[PDB]
Design an enzyme around this catalytic site. Structure first.
Site, mmCIF file in Angstrom:
data_model
loop_
_atom_site.group_PDB
_atom_site.id
_atom_site.type_symbol
_atom_site.label_atom_id
_atom_site.label_comp_id
_atom_site.label_asym_id
_atom_site.label_seq_id
_atom_site.Cartn_x
_atom_site.Cartn_y
_atom_site.Cartn_z
ATOM 1 N N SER A 1 -30.066 -26.336 -14.748
ATOM 2 C CA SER A 1 -30.235 -25.156 -13.913
ATOM 3 C C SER A 1 -31.153 -24.162 -14.629
ATOM 4 O O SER A 1 -32.295 -24.497 -14.938
ATOM 5 C CB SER A 1 -28.859 -24.584 -13.537
ATOM 6 O OG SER A 1 -28.897 -23.400 -12.757
ATOM 7 N N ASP B 1 -28.177 -31.213 -3.945
ATOM 8 C CA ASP B 1 -28.007 -29.954 -4.646
ATOM 9 C C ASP B 1 -28.267 -28.799 -3.685
ATOM 10 O O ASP B 1 -29.337 -28.735 -3.086
ATOM 11 C CB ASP B 1 -28.991 -29.855 -5.814
ATOM 12 C CG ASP B 1 -28.584 -28.891 -6.894
ATOM 13 O OD1 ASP B 1 -28.149 -27.779 -6.558
ATOM 14 O OD2 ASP B 1 -28.719 -29.241 -8.077
ATOM 15 N N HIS C 1 -24.285 -30.026 -7.691
ATOM 16 C CA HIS C 1 -25.117 -29.331 -8.658
ATOM 17 C C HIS C 1 -24.662 -29.549 -10.097
ATOM 18 O O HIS C 1 -25.432 -29.321 -11.028
ATOM 19 C CB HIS C 1 -25.116 -27.820 -8.339
ATOM 20 C CG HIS C 1 -25.928 -26.979 -9.276
ATOM 21 N ND1 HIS C 1 -27.301 -27.147 -9.403
ATOM 22 C CD2 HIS C 1 -25.532 -25.993 -10.106
ATOM 23 C CE1 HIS C 1 -27.693 -26.261 -10.308
ATOM 24 N NE2 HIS C 1 -26.656 -25.541 -10.751
#
Ligand SMILES: CC(=O)/C=C/C=C(C)\C=C\C1=C(C)C[C@H](O)CC1(C)C
EC number: 3.1.-.-
Length: 265
Positions: free
Chosen positions: A96, A217, A246
């Site tokens: 991320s 995601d 995710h």
């Protein structure tokens, strides 16, 4: 200040190998997100973990709203940790926001990274002309309003979506670390990240890169994978996990570990 960073950001070193593996968590989590993957690597790798300044496991007084206005201070923190530990070479796994941080860091310091492993990585979340990032400015403003009005209700609705797969243990964990974050920090960091754009610097990447996209995601459309293949400057590989969500490191640790195991130097 910049000097007690090892303690401030909970820097921990585990494992036995000579080869240094850096595990860097993303938004809403802390380093504990790596705990299911960690046993797969500690016999062969020297593993370095830390918490982002915005993690709820970090003293919130360290989060200077005046300073953390873009990704650059986050990169400064990463490199400060690296230099403070005397690391000259490592493999880096960024999830991320830490994927975004690693990209910038590798441009600044190409020699530091033998390989970039990027999980749930997007160069830009907002949609542009001919670019599908997956979000729009109006949508994002409503998210920010919900976060401000009732952060905890937002987390309650969001955590399952983000985890994606029906893994209650994973949802509970991600909820925990989101609830640990001071609400105004979560909102501020979200604002920072949503208004970032690395599309302009992807071509400058020289380090070998593995992009691990997930199946579905909420933060990263499938189209982003192909975009990254086209635009990343280094020797790049793109791979897609079969599991959705995710947070593969929590929801599908065995599968993620497998991908990592063959991607790592
Ligand atoms: C409410 C809704 O559906 C839309 C999500 C809204 C949040 C706040 C997104 C948070 C983040 C996700 C989890 C992972 C990205 O890597 C970074 C980023 C800060 C964008």
């Amino acid at each position: 200040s910049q000097h007690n960073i090892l303690e401030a950001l909970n820097v921990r070193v585990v494992g036995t190998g000579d080869r240094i593996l850096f595990l860097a968590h993303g938004f809403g989590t802390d380093q504990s997100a790596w705990h299911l993957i960690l046993p797969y690597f500690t016999q062969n790798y020297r593993v370095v973990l830390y918490d982002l300044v915005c993690a709820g496991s970090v003293n919130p007084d360290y989060f200077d709203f005046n300073r953390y206005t873009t990704l650059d201070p986050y990169v400064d923190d990463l490199l400060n940790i690296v230099d403070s530990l005397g690391i000259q070479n490592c493999a880096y796994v960024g999830h991320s926001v830490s994927a975004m941080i690693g990209i910038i860091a590798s441009i600044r310091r190409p020699e530091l990274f033998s390989k970039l492993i990027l999980i749930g990585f997007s160069p830009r979340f907002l949609n542009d002309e001919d670019y599908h990032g997956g979000f729009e400015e109006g949508e994002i403003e409503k998210v920010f309003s919900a976060m401000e009005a009732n952060y905890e209700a937002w987390v309650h609705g969001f955590a399952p979506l983000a985890v994606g797969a029906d893994v209650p243990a994973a949802v509970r964990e991600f909820s925990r670390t989101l609830f640990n974050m001071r609400p105004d920090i979560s909102l501020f960091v979200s604002r920072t990240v949503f208004n970032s754009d690395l599309r302009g610097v992807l071509g400058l990447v020289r380090v070998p890169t593995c992009v691990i996209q997930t199946a579905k995601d909420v933060s990263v459309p499938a189209s982003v994978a192909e975009y990254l293949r086209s635009h990343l400057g280094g020797d790049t590989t793109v791979e897609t996990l079969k599991t959705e969500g995710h947070l593969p490191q929590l929801s599908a640790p065995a599968q993620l570990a497998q991908f990592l195991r063959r991607a790592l130097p």
